Amino acid sequence: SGAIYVGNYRVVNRHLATHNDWANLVWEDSSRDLLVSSTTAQGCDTIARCDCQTGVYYCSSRRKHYPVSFSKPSLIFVEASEYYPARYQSHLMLAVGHSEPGDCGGILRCQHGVVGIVSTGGNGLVGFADVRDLLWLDE
Numbered sequence: 001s002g003a004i005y006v007g008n009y010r011v012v013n014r015h016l017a018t019h020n021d022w023a024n025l026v027w028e029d030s031s032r033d034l035l036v037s038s039t040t041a042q043g044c045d046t047i048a049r050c051d052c053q054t055g056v057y058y059c060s061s062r063r064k065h066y067p068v069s070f071s072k073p074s075l076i077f078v079e080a081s082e083y084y085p086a087r088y089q090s091h092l093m094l095a096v097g098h099s100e101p102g103d104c105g106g107i108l109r110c111q112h113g114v115v116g117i118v119s120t121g122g123n124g125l126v127g128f129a130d131v132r133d134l135l136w137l138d139e
């Protein structure tokens, strides 16, 4: 679990969005596994606007942060799950690192701010949904 709080927006994995997220919907994209909802309180986070390919992510299944080198945002095949049919997920970045079900929502950060959130996993792999192109989160 996990979310980004920036301005009057809350960014979460679309597959983990609550009834309240959907009732205050701003934007969602099933192909990116992202959903943004509106908040009444001002958030705590800054979004990175950069091309970093190294950073640190929080891994809830280890209660620890790990450094990673990650690929550029791209269209990657993701196998069927309880939440989605088999499909290509866009704006996804992969890295070698630990992840397991329960870890989605963990934040990936570089020196400039928040880069994205955990969205997929593999055997010794972790995938992150990029948010750096969503310039409207800043306004």
Ligand SMILES: CSc1nc2c(cc1NC(=O)N1CCC[C@H](C(N)=O)C1)CCCC2
Pocket: 015, 033, 078, 081, 083, 084, 089, 099, 100, 101, 102, 103, 104, 118, 119, 120, 121, 122, 123
């Ligand atoms: C960290 S999540 C995770 N981790 C692992 C496995 C599986 C998962 N789960 C997923 O990848 N998804 C399920 C939820 C929707 C995700 C999506 N973006 O389409 C896909 C298997 C075994 C190794 C670890």
Ligand SMILES: [Zn+2]
Pocket: 048, 049, 050, 051, 052, 110, 111, 112, 113
């Ligand atoms: Zn950066």
